[PDB]
Amino acid sequence: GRLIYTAGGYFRQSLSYLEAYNPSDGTWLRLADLQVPRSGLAGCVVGGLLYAVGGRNNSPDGNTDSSALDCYNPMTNQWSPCAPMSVPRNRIGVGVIDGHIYAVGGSHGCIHHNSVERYEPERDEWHLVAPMLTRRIGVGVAVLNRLLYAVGGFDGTNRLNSAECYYPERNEWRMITAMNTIRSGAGVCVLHNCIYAAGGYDGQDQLNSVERYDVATATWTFVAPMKHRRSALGITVHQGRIYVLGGYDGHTFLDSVECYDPDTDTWSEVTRMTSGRSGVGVAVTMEPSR
Numbered sequence: 001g002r003l004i005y006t007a008g009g010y011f012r013q014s015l016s017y018l019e020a021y022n023p024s025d026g027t028w029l030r031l032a033d034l035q036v037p038r039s040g041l042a043g044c045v046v047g048g049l050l051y052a053v054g055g056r057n058n059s060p061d062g063n064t065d066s067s068a069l070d071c072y073n074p075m076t077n078q079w080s081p082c083a084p085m086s087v088p089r090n091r092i093g094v095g096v097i098d099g100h101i102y103a104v105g106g107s108h109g110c111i112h113h114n115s116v117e118r119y120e121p122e123r124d125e126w127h128l129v130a131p132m133l134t135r136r137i138g139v140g141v142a143v144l145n146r147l148l149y150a151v152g153g154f155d156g157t158n159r160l161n162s163a164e165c166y167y168p169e170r171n172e173w174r175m176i177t178a179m180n181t182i183r184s185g186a187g188v189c190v191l192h193n194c195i196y197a198a199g200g201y202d203g204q205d206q207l208n209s210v211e212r213y214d215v216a217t218a219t220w221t222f223v224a225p226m227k228h229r230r231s232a233l234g235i236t237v238h239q240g241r242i243y244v245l246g247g248y249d250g251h252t253f254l255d256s257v258e259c260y261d262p263d264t265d266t267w268s269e270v271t272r273m274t275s276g277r278s279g280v281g282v283a284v285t286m287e288p289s290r
């Protein structure tokens with residue numbers, strides 16, 4: 001059985017929570033805290049292990065962006081550190097190809113990264129790869145056919161509808177068709193061989209619209225919108241459905257969790273997080289050992 005894990009986040013300060021939602025019995029399981037409260041991080045899973053990448057520690061004692069990589073083992077309910085990235089990356093995006101973690105974009109202070117680096121778990125080593133054509137913070141990242149896509153974001157001046165595609169074999173980025181909508185802080189994921197971009201912020205409004213990229217047609221198409229507009233949401237796929245968690249709607253830090261069914265093209269609100277928050281890292285892996 002697999003659960004939806006949400007790590008970190010922001011509500012008045014960065015958070016250390018690790019909680020796991022069971023879509024069947026509806027429970028939230030409170031697990032070992034992050035070593036450091038972090039928001040604006042990303043989550044992913046390699047070899048059953050949950051990784052928390054980047055982010056920022058906003059605390060009443062001071063604020064710092066994070067280069068950290070940390071690993072959670074559900075079999076032991078323990079976190080352990082990994083080697084850090086070359087630079088701190090707040091509002092990062094990540095994707096997994098061939099068992100390697102790609103860290104994309106994000107910010108360090110006023111620096112908006114176009115740089116990208118790759119983590120090899122079997123060596124605990126990071127290595128820089130070719131930088132993106134665009135500086136992107138609040139970038140959404142997805143992997144399709146072992147190509148890495150970076151979608152949207154904020155370049156420090158403009159928010160973006162552009163998307164680009166990384167070919168690992170060429171070590172080269174190439175622009176693709178832009179989204180219909182400018183989005184920073186959207187949730188981006190892959191489902192049934194399409195890239196979905198949900199929500200985000202366009203510099204005026206937080207968004208509820210959702211669009212889907214078909215690589216065969218190189219076209220973005222709108223699908224059903226979410227019930228609640230939200231930026232800095234967490235997103236993941238569990239058993240063929242998309243789940244979006246939390247975020248910010250210009251007024252409150254949401255605890256709403258919505259679920260997209262592709263067969264019916266409908267969003268449903270399925271649970272609430274134990275407290276509202278934005279900027280979480282989210283991923284799916286085996287339930288913890290009791």
Ligand SMILES: [Cl-]
Nearest residue numbers: 042043281282
């Ligand atoms: Cl994430």
